[PDB]
Amino acid sequence: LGRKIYEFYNAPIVKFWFYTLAYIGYLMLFNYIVLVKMERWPSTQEWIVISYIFTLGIEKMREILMSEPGKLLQKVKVWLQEYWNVTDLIAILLFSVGMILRLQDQPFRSDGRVIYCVNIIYWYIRLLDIFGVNKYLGPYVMMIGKMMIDMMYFVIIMLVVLMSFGVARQAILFPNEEPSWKLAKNIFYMPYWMIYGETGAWIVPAIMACYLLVANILLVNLLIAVFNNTFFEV
Amino acid sequence: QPFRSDGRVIYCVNIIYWYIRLLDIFGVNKYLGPYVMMIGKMMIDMMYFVIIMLVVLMSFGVARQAILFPNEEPSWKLAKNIFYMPYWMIYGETGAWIVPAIMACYLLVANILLVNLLIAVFNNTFFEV
Ligand SMILES: Cc1cc(NC(=O)[C@H](c2ccccc2)N2CCCc3ccccc32)no1
């Protein structure tokens, strides 16, 4: 009975479907500690989450060391050369400064929690790595990969053609204001709410809205096709 | 009462199924049949999308109703808000630039990528079928 359970736990099939059960633990227990008020000291549900990060950190340190290259510089550098490994590291460091801020008195607590909420962003995203072990989920995760850079270049078109109307609208509809900074933030958030927005003086707001039509139909349809070719080859 | 109401709601769900049944008939017509088979293929592909979408959108949801509503006690219905409220919050709006970072990345993948991913996948389904 001993040699059986000993063998069984060391199986790689098990280590997948046990670590992820530990981990659906983390993505349930963390969503219960930032979606409730905290208090001056860590609650027990937060102590388990805190311990999850730290025990992950000491396991990261095992791969930092026990990797094949012998000199410590290269020993680190190869682990640092894998992309998902570094974004583990920076988010561990973020959760560590999360608990440094979450340990002092307010307004320190106010910060700690924001740093907590940006970590729940990363650890959800981590699933991507692991959802590429499925034969079905695998191609999707990877096509987000290829499409990401295409979208990084599309926003170069998008800002040039849509901040166009974001500035002109505040250069016409908005009055004569001096560097207000909030205005800089208005020029690209009024389009986020363009849905709720409508001699010749009514000429100009009509011309701006209609090539806004031409531009956004052309653009939406533009991406409608640029991921189209790529989902064929992926 | 309360038996009648419950029975009416159950009859109302039987409406849904007894409309869906027609999909077996569509098979008879040479134009509706392929559309129905494409319903099935799109259904399975949509399931796998719901998994991925749930990861990305739920991440922004849990961040959102953490940062907004900055305080609560263990709430029986707050889970009912964390997906439904940002969905209906399409009109929904010193460190006041951090919340636009969450708002910024929220639609960065939810639509530009996830919604487009659906288009791609349903168009892929189309080609074989
Ligand atoms: C906190 C926290 C994160 C975490 N999980 C991982 O970051 C990751 C993993 C991801 C999905 C399923 C199972 C595990 N993981 C855990 C241990 C170090 C490691 C090494 C290589 C590959 C994955 C991996 N557990 O707690």
| DSSP symbols for A154-178 | HHHHHHHHHHHHHHHHHHHTS-S--
Resolution value, angstrom units: 4.0
| Token pair listed for A73 | 């510089």
Smallest CA–CA separation between A182 and chain B, in Å?
A: 11
Cis-peptide, bond into residue B2, ω within 30° of zero: yes
Tell me the CA distances in angstroms from A20 to A17, A27, A31, A45, A198, one per residue in order.
6, 10, 16, 19, 50
Report the distance separating Cα A16 and Cα A14, nearest Å: 5
Report the distance separating Cα B72 and Cα A37, nearest Å: 5
Elucidation method? cryo-EM
Tell me which chain B residues have a C-beta less than 8 angstroms from the C-beta of A35: 62, 65-66, 72, 75, 78, 82
Among candidate residues A51, A26, A231, A45, the one with its CA nearest the CA of residue A130:
A26
| Token pair listed for B35 | 């559309």
Largest CA distance in chain A: 94
The DSSP code for B112 is I
**Residues A210/A230, Cβ–Cβ less than 8 Å:** no
Residue in the block written with tokens 């561990």: A92
- From the CA of A50, how far away is ligand 1's center (Å)? 15
Report the distance separating Cα A113 and Cα A42, nearest Å: 12
With an 8 Å Cβ cutoff, are B117 and A227 in contact?
yes
Question: Exposed, middle or buried by CB within 10 Å (0-12, 13-18, 19+), for B127?
Answer: exposed
Nearest by CB: B123 against A36, A154, A228: A228
Backbone angles phi, psi at A79, to 5 degrees: -60, -35
Angle between helices B78-88 and B33-67 (to 10 degrees): 110
The DSSP code for B114 is I
Half-sphere exposure of A135 (CA within 13 A, CB side): 0
> Residue B106 CB: number of other CB atoms within 10 A?
20
Nearest by CB: A120 against B52, B59, B73: B59
Report the distance separating Cα A57 and Cα B115, nearest Å: 35
Chain A CB within 8 Å of residue B56 CB: yes
**Residues A91/A30, Cβ–Cβ less than 8 Å:** no
Q: State which residue of chain A sits closest to B77, comparing Cα positions.
A: A35
Among candidate residues A214, A108, A185, A141, the one with its CA nearest the CA of residue B93:
A185
> Residue B123 CB: number of other CB atoms within 10 A?
14
Smallest CA–CA separation between A151 and chain B, in Å?
A: 8
Report the distance separating Cα B40 and Cα A122, nearest Å: 34
